[PDB]
Design a binder for this molecule. Structure first.
Ligand SMILES: *[C@@H](C(=O)NCCc1ccccn1)[C@H](O)C(=O)N[C@@H](Cc1ccccc1)C(=O)N(C)C
Length: 220
């Protein structure tokens, strides 16, 4: 695999968004991966509606602002035959009834692929597919206050993830501890969090925070 990857440079990634006070991280993770795969197919980067997923993907198993899974979101887009654009169905950070309109659908998928639960497999997926939906243990004060550098949290769980995010690449930079590799991760907490909304998560440190434990992407 390449030693460094950044899909933002290839045009696959919309700007950082903000989920507000709704527990809809799974929807932002899902739209991010679908935005990448739609761009791969069509050459058009179109921001997709997280509100559409929050309001409408309950039958696939999602629970709105009470949580969800990216895979259930990809299943919804397939079952539903579409997904509205962000501009057409904007984000309100509260669960409401479904208002999906197919006339404004700008994306589709034919299912999804789950990646084996190993960081080496996640790397191969990132290197060859595009941005990848993942879940991490973000439930630590250190994650809230992150400003820069490689995030490493000794109390992080590789099994109990609570936050869906998007891996857009990976790379390295020299550090004191010589644990130099990182996953480049797009969050959904606005650009005032972290490094313009991004975090470099420790890579090849025993599946730190569970980043390879729930990785997937939509088939377009
Ligand atoms: C994610 C979310 O919206 N998190 C925002 C609040 C927050 C603040 C600080 C730290 C962490 N979180 C939702 O809570 C959500 O959908 N959670 C999912 C993430 C997930 C896990 C495994 C596989 C896919 C997605 C979740 O915790 N579970 C168990 C589904």
């Amino acid at each position: 695999a390449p030693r460094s990857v950044d899909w933002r440079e290839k045009g696959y990634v919309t700007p950082v968004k903000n989920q507000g006070q709704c527990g809809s991280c799974w929807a932002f993770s899902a739209t991010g991966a679908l935005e990448g795969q739609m761009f791969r197919k069509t050459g058009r980067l179109i921001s997709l509606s997280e509100q559409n997923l929050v309001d409408c993907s309950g039958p696939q198993g999602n629970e709105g602002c009470n949580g969800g899974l990216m895979d259930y979101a990809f299943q919804y887009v397939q079952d539903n035959g579409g997904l509205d654009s962000e501009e057409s169905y904007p984000y309100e950070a509260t669960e409401e009834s479904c208002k999906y309109n197919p006339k404004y659908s700008v994306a589709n998928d034919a299912g999804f692929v789950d990646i084996p639960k190993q960081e080496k497999a996640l790397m191969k997926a990132v290197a060859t597919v595009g941005p990848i939906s993942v879940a991490i243990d973000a439930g630590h004060e250190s994650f809230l206050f992150y400003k820069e550098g490689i995030y490493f949290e000794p109390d992080c769980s590789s099994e109990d993830m609570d936050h869906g995010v998007l891996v857009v690449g990976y790379g390295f930079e020299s550090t004191e501890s010589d644990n130099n590799k990182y996953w480049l991760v797009k969050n959904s907490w606005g650009e005032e969090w972290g490094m313009g909304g991004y975090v470099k998560m420790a890579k090849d440190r025993r599946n730190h925070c569970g980043i390879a434990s729930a990785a997937s992407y939509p088939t377009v």
